[PDB]
Write a sequence for this structure.
């Protein structure tokens, strides 16, 4: 038989669920989630790295002219100049005065080291969800990893769990993304064509090792000076090397909901949002009968003292009569008070550790088909900040109608019956007529 | 490659606000963020002796200074004087702990 | 004498042979290979003042 449960998706939080079946011992189970992740389905657009300006030798022709046949290459740029007088170490290079020409050619290419460092922009689509749970119910406690797709099921000792669907698609991502060595960023990177020179990725490559590429480096050439043989080339400096300095604030720090981002592969783990549903189907190895467990009565329990902690700082001792020694499991039946000790061995006395800091929890606890109630007062703590998350899920900050709302019954108000007496004076004034 | 760790920061724990005072030997970086749906966050460069006052709501606050592990902090519940001590200290005790509803109630 | 601010160490005079200190000193374990000793504390706040 299968039934539902809601598990609050926060790491370390304990949750209790109860199975009910007429004729057997009541059983409960404790669940605690540890590992989560959201692998997003990434595709590729293009990568970018630093560029380089390969400049071959400037072939000079004296009293002649050349003709530069082009090349299928990125931004192959040809320039032919007249009126040069190259003046090298050996006097002049050639001997002519008016027909001299100089040829300067240069191109822009992907640098040799960015096979190991590079940025890669991805398009970013919907993700998935995996979980790790602890399934302690006294009988042997297993750990489990499983998906949240619903179809995927994993069973221990004939007892199976299914998880999906999910409660929310609250993503710590966007549609467009860019990944560096250890960070992820969200800026709307330009398309494959728009190589704005000096912005992000003015060089683009569709993979690590494609033999074709694209560049818009903004490259031009100028005529040399008197004497010096060189290649004056004007260029916008790198945009990629600019982006390394002119962009702080990655998503690793700006991440919502306190989740944690880790690269290789791109994943976000231990997010804290929404709940997860779970349907569980039991087996008959620990689903124990009624006429075997302790059958007690006159559950003369009580409380001891209570604090407004965030951890186990509410202690409640509870007494009872032992009919036969064994173990029985306890469980709350309202949302105000959680318990820590799942199973207490019924022998003489007992003591439980409840945790609820809202005001003054009046909560019903139960042990082996038996119902009682407890109530106390609680003082606030003295500290201000601690090093562990909450343990009371209670937004139920109201005290539930006791020990501070008694003044409502005090200041009810009363006097409406006096106006009933006044309308009785109306009844006695109409008797004459 | 090795890298120097930075000295510790002793926190001082006020109501909903935690103050951590740095003694940097080198110029370093401070980073912190809230934990809730609303991502309120900042980061700062630190050069000399200076205090920084970061908020702490109930949803939690993480921060990391230098090359350390990221550290977490959480307001415990709230603090006040005497709760349910009979005369009107109940409304004073509910002057903490989301007070706006209490004002419209009174 | 909260460490780092003024008055991190003190003594009644130049010769009071016991002295107060709250310099937050703690020592950790070394990494493998080299023999040394690590230890961490806030620097001498007097020079900061
Ligand atoms: C089953 O059941 C149980 C209950 O009792 C549980 O538990 C508890 O838990 C906890 C958590 O984990 C533990 O703890 C551990 O250990 C470790 C080692 O190292 C440490 O570190 C930590 O801290 C802690 O302490 C304990 O132990 C326990 N208890 C008992 C067992 O008794 C569990 O978990 C379950 N499961 C299994 C498998 O066992």
């Amino acid at each position: 038989y299968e039934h539902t449960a809601v598990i609050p998706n926060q790491v370390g939080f304990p949750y209790k669920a109860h199975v009910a079946r007429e004729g057997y011992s009541p059983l409960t189970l404790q669940m605690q989630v540890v590992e989560t992740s959201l692998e997003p389905t990434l595709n590729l657009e293009y990568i970018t790295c630093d560029y380089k300006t390969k400049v071959p030798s400037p072939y000079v022709k004296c009293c002649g002219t050349a003709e530069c046949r082009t090349q299928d290459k990125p931004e192959y740029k040809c320039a032919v100049f007249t009126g040069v007088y190259p003046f090298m170490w050996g006097g002049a290079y050639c001997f002519c005065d008016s027909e001299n020409t100089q040829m300067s050619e240069a191109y822009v290419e992907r640098a040799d080291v960015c096979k190991h460092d590079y940025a890669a922009a991805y398009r970013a689509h919907t993700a998935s969800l995996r979980a790790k749970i602890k399934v302690t119910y006294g009988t042997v406690n297993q750990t489990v990893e499983a998906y949240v797709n619903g179809d995927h099921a994993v069973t221990i000792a004939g007892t199976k769990f299914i998880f999906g669907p999910v409660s929310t698609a609250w993503t710590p991502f966007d549609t467009k993304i860019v990944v560096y060595k250890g960070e992820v960023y969200n800026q709307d990177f330009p398309p494959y064509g728009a190589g704005q020179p000096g912005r992000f990725g003015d060089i683009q490559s569709r993979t690590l090792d494609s033999k074709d590429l694209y560049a818009n480096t903004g490259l031009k050439l100028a005529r040399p000076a008197a004497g010096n043989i060189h290649v004056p080339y004007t260029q916008t400096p790198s945009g990629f090397k600019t982006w390394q300095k002119d962009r702080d604030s990655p998503l690793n720090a700006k991440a919502p909901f306190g989740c944690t981002i880790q690269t290789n592969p791109v994943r976000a783990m231990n997010c804290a949002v929404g709940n997860i549903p779970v349907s569980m189907d039991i087996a008959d190895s620990a689903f124990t009968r009624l006429t075997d467990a302790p059958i007690i009565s006159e559950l003369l329990c009580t409380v001891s003292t209570c604090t407004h902690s965030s951890d186990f700082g509410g202690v409640a001792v509870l007494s009872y009569k032992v009919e036969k020694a064994g173990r029985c499991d306890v469980h709350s039946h309202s949302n105000v008070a959680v318990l820590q000790e799942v199973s207490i061995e019924a022998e003489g006395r007992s003591v439980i550790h409840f945790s609820t800091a809202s005001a003054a929890p009046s909560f019903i606890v139960s042990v082996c088909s038996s119902r009682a109630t407890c109530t106390a007062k609680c003082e606030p703590p003295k500290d201000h900040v601690v090093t562990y998350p909450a343990n009371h899920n209670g937004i139920t900050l109201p005290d539930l109608s006791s020990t501070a709302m008694t003044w409502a019954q005090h200041l009810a108000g009363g006097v409406g019956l006096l106006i009933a007496l006044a309308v009785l004076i109306l009844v006695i004034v109409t008797c004459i007529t | 490659c090795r890298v120097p760790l930075a000295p510790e920061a002793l926190v001082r724990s006020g109501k909903r606000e935690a103050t951590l005072s740095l003694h940097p030997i080198h110029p370093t970086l401070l980073s912190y963020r809230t934990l809730g749906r609303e991502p309120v966050f900042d980061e700062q460069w630190i050069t000399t002796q200076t205090e920084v006052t970061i908020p702490v709501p109930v949803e939690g606050v993480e921060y990391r200074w230098g090359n350390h592990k990221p550290q977490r902090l959480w307001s415990q519940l709230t603090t006040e004087g005497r709760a349910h001590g009979w005369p009107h200290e109940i409304i004073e005790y509910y002057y903490g702990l989301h007070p706006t509803t209490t004002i419209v109630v009174v």
Chain A has four helices and 31 strands. The radius of gyration of chain A is 39 Å.
